[PDB]
Design a protein around this ligand. Structure first.
Ligand SMILES: [Co+2]
Ligand SMILES: [Co+2]
Ligand SMILES: [Fe+3]
Ligand SMILES: [Fe+3]
Lengths: 314, 314
């Protein structure tokens, strides 16, 4: 297939190259930014995103997939400015990130109406531009598969069947929300190989992770650097074990890094070892060197960062 | 006190004149408008608001209080354009309308931080303008007094104690959310006479309505025309009974009219009598004529629409 890119002509999926599948140029709550602009500094957000993207490119990253959608402050014009300043291939998406209920707008509205919003972004363009969405992003977390969460999942299935774009999820690794997302999507006719079940790297429960991979979907070991969810060393051991056991062709690795994010800062926790620097390049500083010196060869690295994204977007 | 007005110098509260205490120039879900602008037409929204405001002014309305805040799409620049086009006195507010949880921005943030946002809008101005907020708006509905709902209530109390602006609420008339809002605010030191408990006209449970008025707060008979909550005739009978029983000095009347609103349309219900035309002038067409021909004198009308707002803002 051809993948739409922000600020560029679309590319063939075979040309995606080395990809970070889950990173955020910027995240914010739409209602807070609209109501209290004094809390934000767009110039700093722009500088932060440009600098992070440039650093990723210096390590060989060719494409970044950014699943900032409704609920996380997607801004296609900000994204296109970052592209112009860096030259990155940037894949933007459509979708909705909620944990409980949809915004009031959606009262009395059908799953088809929700799907039409996603299809609009895929076929016509995002936010009044010709930049088109290349995937759909959906979520579930601690509250489980609520009524409105299910509506969004089913709308993503409709958009995938109509346009063939893949689906990226946010899940909570400690309930079975990821497993439920996969099942609900596949029951609607979505190819399991067109789904990335997100945030599975937040657990060391390898049997749960493997169960989802064995059902055909990519597994998101996608929060490297967020020690609050799982420390880097345990993520590395889980990643290494999955590679040793033959799961390279389902593994996707990223950081979920937010070059800026507006949420309040949680209480710091200090451990014996110096805290890792969460960024878009931590895997080049820590994870990839760790895998290599544990015997993981170059072909595994190419599978995870090139072949798997290529398949996902094919 | 002096009441700040959008696009005008502040006025003494004695000069507020005939007031509609709860009307919306425009409502939308911030995240949906940001992500799917194709669903909206600002020129139509502007025309609708200007035309409604002009009609209200033709019946003698001097001031409109608009409690559109975070969660309902407050836009101070849109409001100031409507003022420029009409000459209305418009009171804008600050606050947050949620039913369950706050946006992700508020994770790990204190009640004091929330109050600081409201105080910023009151003292410094709304959305980067010098238009200042003249009241705080808070909500609770079917989910009851959740953790985050309580946080917003307590933040409104802090803002009221610091700045002396009054508090308008949204409640669900069929639970005791309005009674709970009143109690929580008064326990924090808010004068009950600085509170309007909203949406009480949605019930004909006169004992519940009177209980709140007797605890010192204004009662919002504030959704005239929304037959889905309560039909006009039963609202009129409840209003008349409250007047007959001596409650004029606590009654506030409005329509909650939204000149535009983005929410999906509920299923229509057709009754034997022609449905009333919900607008900002329905009370001049129906309610006020009904009260007068049932013996309600001009002094009652002046109490409800002039003296009560004056007290509320004093
Ligand atoms: Co996520
Ligand atoms: Co309300
Ligand atoms: Fe993310
Ligand atoms: Fe309202």
């Amino acid at each position: 297939m051809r993948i739409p890119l922000v600020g560029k002509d679309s590319i063939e999926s075979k040309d995606i190259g080395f990809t970070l599948i889950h990173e955020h140029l910027r995240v914010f709550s739409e209602a807070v930014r609209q109501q209290w602009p004094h809390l934000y500094n767009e110039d700093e957000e722009f500088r932060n995103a440009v600098n992070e993207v440039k650093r990723a490119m210096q390590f060989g990253v060719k494409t970044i997939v950014d699943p900032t959608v409704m609920g996380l402050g997607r801004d296609i014009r900000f994204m296109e400015k970052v592209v112009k300043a860096t030259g990155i291939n940037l894949v933007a998406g459509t979708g909705i990130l909620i944990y409980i209920d949809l915004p009031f707008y959606f009262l009395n509205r059908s799953i088809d109406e929700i799907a039409d919003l996603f299809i609009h972004d895929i076929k016509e363009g995002i936010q009044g531009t010709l930049n088109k969405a290349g995937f759909v992003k959906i979520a579930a977390d601690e509250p489980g598969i609520t009524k409105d969460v299910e509506k969004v999942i089913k709308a993503a299935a409709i958009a995938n069947k109509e346009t063939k774009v893949p689906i990226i999820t946010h899940s909570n690794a400690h309930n079975n929300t990821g497993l439920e997302q996969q099942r609900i999507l596949t029951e609607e006719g979505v190819d399991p190989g067109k789904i990335l079940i997100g945030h599975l790297g937040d657990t060391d429960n390898i049997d749960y992770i493997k169960k989802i991979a064995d059902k055909g979907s990519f597994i998101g070991l996608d929060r490297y650097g967020l020690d609050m969810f799982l420390p880097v060393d345990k993520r590395n051991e889980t990643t290494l074990r999955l590679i040793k056991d033959g799961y390279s062709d389902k593994i996707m690795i990223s950081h979920d890094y937010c070059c800026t994010i507006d949420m309040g800062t949680a209480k710091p926790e200090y451990k014996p070892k110096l805290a890792p620097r969460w960024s878009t390049t931590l895997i080049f500083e820590d994870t990839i060197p760790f895998l290599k010196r544990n015997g993981v060869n170059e072909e595994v690295i190419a599978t995870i960062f090139k072949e798997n994204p290529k398949k996902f977007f094919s």
